[PDB]
From a paper:
Human APOBEC3 (A3) cytidine deaminases are antiviral factors that are particularly potent against retroviruses. As a countermeasure, HIV-1 uses a viral infectivity factor (Vif) to target specific human A3s for proteasomal degradation. In this process, Vif adopts a “double-hijack” mechanism by recruiting cellular T-cell transcription cofactor CBF-β and Cullin-5 (CUL5) E3 ubiquitin ligase complex comprising CUL5, Elogin B (ELOB) and C (ELOC), and RING-box protein 2 (RBX2) to induce polyubiquitin chain formation on A3 proteins for subsequent proteasomal degradation. Vif nucleates the entire complex by directly binding four human proteins, A3H, CBF-β, CUL5, and ELOC.
The same cryo-EM data contained a class of A3H-unbound dimeric form of VCBCC complex, which was reconstructed to 3.5 Å resolution. All three Cullin-repeats (CR1-3) are visible in this form, likely because the Cullin-arm is stabilized by the additional contact with Vif from the other molecule within the dimer. The architecture of the VCBCC complex core resembles that of the previously reported crystal structure. Vif α/β-domain forms a globular core with CBF-β by forming an antiparallel β-sheet between Vif β1 and CBF-β β2-3. A small Vif α-domain with a zinc-coordinating site mediates the recruitment of ELOB/C and CUL5 through a three-way interaction between Vif-ELOC-CUL5, which is typical for CUL5 recruiting SOCS-box containing substrate receptors.
Author numbering:
A (entry chain 2), F (entry chain 7): 12 to 118, 133 to 319
B (entry chain 4), G (entry chain 9): 17 to 49, 58 to 111
C (entry chain 0), J (entry chain 5): 7 to 75, 84 to 88, 94 to 157
D (entry chain 3), H (entry chain 8): 1 to 79, 89 to 96
E (entry chain 1), I (entry chain 6): 3 to 75, 81 to 140, 143 to 157, 160 to 173
Write the structure that this text describes.
């Protein structure tokens, strides 16, 4: 009575509409639910035929999207097309696996299928390009040219989500793009800090350092992943502090006596904040305080 | 906050939200693109399904003594079909 | 998990209602010597004593630890450490002398919850949650 | 321990929760207010007695033993009763 | 004065002697319980341990202990435990039955739903009805469609009652 | 102004009245309190003179009492005189040291003085006579001739109280008279039990054993010390059980099968009570119970 | 249950029992063979002694802040004598 | 926190305890009943006001600040006042 | 995350610096405190321990610890302890003063009551008035009869106040 | 002794009155970042936090165990084992986020009362009870 071939003809258009990010309706969605359950139950080979049809449609749409994406030879155009297409694809991959709950139970495999297909289609070939473009955009942003944050956020979340390695969810992401981010940020502060310190002054350097620390914190909160914070944000601002304040701790302790004999409130707040970061930085200013005591 | 479960004929079996989410397929059905349509599930099955939903949500922690669920064999096969779809 | 099972599961809901307990024993015998035996058995660790919880067959029971191969207290103190139903609990039901009656209640055992084995507790929870029906592959 | 009651309003089959000692006043305000049905221009029609008119605790405090989860009683509402599907 | 606390359920002698009879019959005569163990009292120097029916639930093991001289239970008692490598926990009768049914007794297999829905035969059944302490609506429906041993199966909810 | 010699003349009669168990008055008692405090304070050597006068009067009265006690050469007359005199003396020793609280604080020494003086006066010479006479009285009492319990109780409490050795309060008492009591009781049951068992019967032996156990328990509660119960009562009824029921455990286990096949309620209660006493008496009756089971 | 502390002249300074037992000599004086006579202790010192008894029995556990006991030097030596006798 | 008061009945100097919000009725029954003095044939004479006649909570609820352990207020009674001894 | 809890009393920097001055003066210049000890902050690697005044109360020892960077006490803190052979207990200021007075500063002797009662002189006195937190009526009377250092004695109740 | 000191001594009477506590800190700074610092300091063991008990200078304080040479809890859990005034106590004062306010109370530590050293406790009690005045012999 009920077989895969008797209803797959009606099944396919709704699957394609869900896949290709098109407008859909609730009633058709519930009819699709009932149809997939009935085909999974009655037909002896119904689940297998459903799975192979799903994989065929997934592969076809992934090939179409990949062909569209590779059309843009320009790096920035390719980046914007890739982020738009990935956002729509990821919304679909969040929506798509819900109908095939009966298929999943009998044998989510659908979400893994989508993620792996998109990965092996596009990510495996343009991961390096996306990475370098992301660092270029983020370093331009840190220079003072604000850009579209959603692009870098989507790049990062594609890195965290499309990790084929099942040992850790964010293994490839954390051990490639996160460490590249730390190295890039460290080199930017290494290039920038001595010039500002030598030119603008001392208290100017401290206030600029505080402002840049706040900006780096907010950019770590927004750009860098915060769903799990797996040694990412902590490593980022730890490298920031060990590249700025641990770097110029000699200047800080040199001016510590001047602060002690001059009673700067902002500098006091700064060193109170920075005792915790330095593993053994407490002793300079506390010994200066006791020299005041003695 | 209730969920409206429209049966095949058109009967509405509106049930408290927290009861309906005991079945996985309902949870997956509400998500994505209230109103839920059950054309294969008629009154003499959906009524007992929602009634079992209430019975299960209340008699699930009471380890003292849980009374059984007497249901007639005249609807038992259709009830198994509904429990295979929803649950 | 265990910290939440107290407030949802019904076994401890019906147990931790400040239940009444009564020492069962030689009720056939005269009360005077019944109370005397209760005293000279509670004072020393060379006997056994039970408490029937006034109505059911669910009765606690104390045995000397020499019979086997956070500590227990037996003045009017009846501390009891035990992992009831897989979740650690503590029972502080005192008894009243000259009447052979008392009260009882259960409290969470935080120390063992933070110190007992975690892999064994997870194994027990997994074994308790699952169901045998529709499991074996056919 | 409370008693679960349900409404049979013509085509509607509201399934909800009731307390053991609920009053008609609080029953009408919210419990049957899912379909936006305030007591104005409406009267409950519980069986033939119709639960009198309301504000009565003599019968609204129904026992939990007569309406067990498996077969809880009905109430009904209007301003008829749809027969359930037959096997 | 040292002391260990063990929750026990007073049980009339009848139930305990019939439970011992059933366990010993099933373990040796029947084949359903050919996996359990048995420890009498002469191998248990504890002054009150009368018998122990050991159930090897795979990695862990359930142990049911019966007592001799409880104060007017001559009055016996029973205490159910889930011992696993020096980690022992008390267990109520319903959960003990549920854990017992998880391994030994039979149940409608995963392929026992589509077969009955489409009218085909069902190969395995559920002789341990008592091992299903509420279940999924599929279980209730299937048991109504397929309504379920001459020497009764050993359950720990029949025992602790009364 | 205030000196010992100026008021000791008035002090002495009230001290003697308190000592010699004579009628006294509250007003004189409070005046004695005030006088002893004033003499202790003002006179430089007042406390020492008070102490030496007290010791002189104590020694004189103790010598008088000892001379009175040794007058009765008859053992029973000496017993009754000694118990009466000791009861009055111990009441005084409980009452006497309260007035000299100031004397005690400046340097109870008074209670120890009385106890040691009476000990070295009379106890050191008639302890053996009192012990043997107490055993004679107690074994006559156990034979069936009720006597004055207060005599033996006073003998025991004099043993517990007049112990000169300060390592333990009741050391001499517990390891002389208590052990003599255990030996005497054990020999009495050894002499008595086999005859009654052979003559009267079996169930008669059990009921008589229960009655005698109850009688021995009540006599341990009354006669034997219960203020501390330092290994005394426990040792006593432990020796009673190991001389009666542990002694005839072979007969008990022989009749255990008869009880099992006859269902005697009183025998059931008796064996149930006697399981705890016997270290390993559980196995016979429980193996018989399983033989019923098997 | 009170204790009657008759002073030298004849004043009665009856005080609650639990207060008076804070002094050892009173405890030893009541024992053996109410009524207590204080011929060497007159009003202007015995009054302060019983008053200190109340003050001490109440302000003995309050570790927060215990106010001092201001007593004039005109009676201080006799008060030391009374505190040497009683306390 | 309560306030401690004493009675100065001619030759008598009852020292006792009073609560912060005590009423005259409960003050007379027991607190001054040590000498077996029921309210019949007696009236308290607190200072000149004499605490009115009784059953008054306006003044009987005296503050604990006015009377302290070192220096508590007096009440007095009759149906005079003995002077304390002078140094 | 491991964590240890220690009760502290916020104290203004005045009180703590004057207490340090008094302790260092009495220990070295005076002779009343020639028995105590002192641990500065460079020999205490703890990030907040600023100083420790060690009081060898015979077998046991009292230890008073001062803190550097409390959150707006720059804000210092103090915590008083009674450490004895790996058994350390917290102690309130009044009890700390009482235990301090038990050994170090001289106090009226046992022969200081009859001497003043009879009019003779009193040889020892009580310079640690603050060490007496209520006392026996003999103490109150004697202190009134004998009403009591130019460099003030170090007390731990003057410090924790405010 | 310790089991009785709770109900008579006034320090714990004034402490175990379900007292209010408030986290002191960077109040000069804004409330939002103050909450952020409280959260990121309470979550991890690399900071310090105090609670002033709303009015006095008697404030608890937590320093990480790495700074030094029954365990503590820091969700909304603030278990604190400490021998206050010679008698073991336990403090279970939770805190409320988004308001920087909370509650507090003390409870007896039975486990340490039955497991801590007895000779040291007796020595401390003897040293606490006695008085220095009229002690040295002259
Ligand atoms: Zn089954
Ligand atoms: Zn002093």
């Amino acid at each position: 009575s009920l077989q895969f071939e008797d209803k797959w003809d009606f099944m396919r258009p709704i699957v394609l509409k869900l896949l290709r990010q098109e407008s859909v309706t609730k009633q058709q969605w519930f009819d699709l639910f009932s149809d997939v359950h009935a085909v999974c139950l009655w037909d002896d080979k119904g689940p297998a035929k459903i799975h192979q049809a799903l994989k065929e449609d997934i592969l076809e749409f992934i090939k179409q999207a990949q062909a569209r994406v590779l059309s843009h030879q320009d790096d920035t155009a390719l980046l914007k097309a890739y982020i738009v297409e990935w956002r729509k694809f990821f919304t679909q991959c969040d929506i798509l696996p819900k109908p095939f709950c009966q298929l999943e139970i009998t044998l989510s495999i659908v979400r893994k299928l989508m993620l792996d297909t998109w990965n092996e289609s596009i990510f495996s070939n343009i991961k390096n390009r996306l990475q370098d473009s992301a660092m270029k955009l983020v370093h331009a942003e840190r220079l003072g040219e604000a850009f579209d944050s959603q692009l870098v956020i989507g790049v990062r979340e594609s890195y965290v989500n499309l990790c084929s390695n099942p040992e850790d969810k964010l293994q490839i992401y954390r051990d490639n793009f996160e460490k590249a981010y730390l190295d890039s940020t460290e080199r930017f502060y290494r290039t920038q800090a001595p010039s500002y310190l030598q030119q603008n002054g001392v208290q100017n350097y401290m206030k600029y350092a505080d402002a840049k620390l706040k900006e780096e914190e907010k950019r770590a909160l927004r750009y860098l992943e915060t769903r799990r914070e797996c040694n990412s944000v902590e490593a980022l601002m730890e490298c920031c502090v060990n590249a700025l304040v641990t770097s110029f701790k000699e200047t800080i302790l040199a001016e510590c006596q001047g602060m002690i004999k001059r009673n700067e409130t902002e500098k006091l707040h700064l060193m109170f904040s920075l005792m915790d970061k330095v593993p053994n930085g407490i002793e300079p200013m506390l010994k200066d305080l006791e020299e005041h005591i003695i | 906050m209730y969920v409206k479960l429209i049966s095949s004929d058109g009967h509405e079996f509106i049930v408290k939200r927290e009861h309906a989410l005991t079945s996985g397929t309902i949870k997956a059905m509400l998500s994505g693109p209230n109103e839920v349509n059950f054309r294969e599930i008629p009154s003499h099955v959906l009524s007992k399904v929602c009634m079992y939903f209430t019975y299960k949500v209340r008699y699930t922690n009471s380890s003292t003594e849980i009374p059984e669920f007497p249901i007639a064999p005249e609807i038992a096969l259709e009830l198994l079909m509904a429990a295979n779809f929803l649950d | 998990d265990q910290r939440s099972k107290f407030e949802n599961e019904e076994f401890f809901r019906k147990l931790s209602r400040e239940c009444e307990i009564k020492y069962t024993g030689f009720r056939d015998r005269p009360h005077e010597e019944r109370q005397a035996r209760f005293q000279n058995a509670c004072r020393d660790g060379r006997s056994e004593i039970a408490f029937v919880a006034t109505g059911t067959n669910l009765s606690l029971q104390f045995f000397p630890a020499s019979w086997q191969g956070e500590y227990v207290d037996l003045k009017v103190y009846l501390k009891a450490p035990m992992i009831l139903n897989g979740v650690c609990v503590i029972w502080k039901g005192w008894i009243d002398l000259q009447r052979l009656d008392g009260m009882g209640c259960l409290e969470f055992d935080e120390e063992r919850a933070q110190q007992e084995d975690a892999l064994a507790q997870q194994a027990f929870e997994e074994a308790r949650r699952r169901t045998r029906e529709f499991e074996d592959r056919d | 321990m409370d008693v679960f009651l349900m409404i049979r309003r013509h085509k509607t089959t509201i399934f909800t929760d009731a307390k053991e000692s609920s009053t008609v006043f609080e029953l009408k305000r919210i419990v049957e207010g899912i379909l936006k049905r305030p007591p104005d221009e409406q009267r409950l029609y519980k069986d033939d007695q119709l639960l009198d008119d309301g504000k009565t605790l003599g019968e609204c405090g129904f026992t939990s033993q007569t309406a067990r989860p498996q077969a809880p009683a009905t109430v009904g509402l209007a301003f008829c009763i749809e027969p359930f599907s037959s096997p | 004065n040292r002391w260990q606390v063990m929750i026990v359920w007073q049980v009339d002698r009848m139930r305990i002697n019939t439970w011992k009879r059933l366990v010993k019959h099933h373990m040796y005569i029947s084949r359903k319980a050919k996996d359990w163990f048995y420890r009498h009292h002469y191998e248990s120097t504890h002054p009150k341990i009368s018998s122990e029916v050991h159930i090897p639930l795979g990695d862990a093991k359930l142990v049911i202990t019966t007592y001799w001289g409880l104060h007017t239970g001559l009055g016996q008692g029973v205490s159910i435990e889930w011992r696993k490598k020096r980690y022992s926990t008390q267990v109520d009768p319903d959960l003990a039955d549920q854990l017992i049914h998880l391994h030994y007794f039979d149940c409608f297999s995963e392929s026992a739903i589509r077969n009955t829905i489409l009218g085909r035969i069902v190969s395995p059944r559920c002789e341990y009805q008592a091992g299903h302490n509420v279940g999924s609506l599929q279980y209730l429906a299937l048991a109504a469609l397929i309504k379920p041993i001459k020497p009764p199966l050993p359950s720990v909810r029949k025992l602790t009652e009364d």
